[PDB]
């Protein structure tokens, strides 16, 4: 019986579109300590290394603010399915 | 702390930062695999182009985390190998 389908609901979508939501907002805390690392690493060692480091730093926040929008619109599509369920029982 | 003036971090702070950096990766990864199970659970439920559309969706994000992934386990990996260099003109003299 725990092996039964759950079976797609608003509050179904909901829950899992905030899952979408949270975990963006998690990457983002995420590259915003990461980003502080690298920031206090300025002035700690050569120029070229600390050159090298922001680079391979800017490049993950890159690939970052292309992850974050995707979580969002995946969220908002179950968000747009959730209301069409709940007008439609109205 | 190193001989070099220019060098005013040690080896042991280099390695603590590479941690955050390998924390970083290992929570991304099991961020998107968190994800992937909710795109599983619904997957069998949607049709057509619904189902395409939420497929392809999770498919761009997975590949996002493929690019940054990699990038944060280089950093880790550099900064470790860096700390191991500079360990040689720490505390020595």
Do not use: H, L, S
């Given at each position: 019986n725990a092996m039964a389908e759950i079976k797609i609901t608003p509050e179904e979508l909901e829950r899992i579109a905030g899952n979408f939501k949270n975990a963006a907002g998690e990457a983002q805390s995420q590259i915003n300590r990461l980003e502080g690392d690298i920031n206090s690493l300025?002035?700690?060692?050569?120029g070229a290394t600390q050159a090298k480091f922001r680079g391979q730093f800017i490049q993950s926040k890159q690939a970052m603010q292309q992850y974050i929008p995707i979580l969002e619109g995946i969220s908002t599509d179950l968000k747009r399915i959730a209301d069409k369920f709940r007008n439609t029982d109205n």
């Open positions: 300025e002035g700690q060692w050569a």
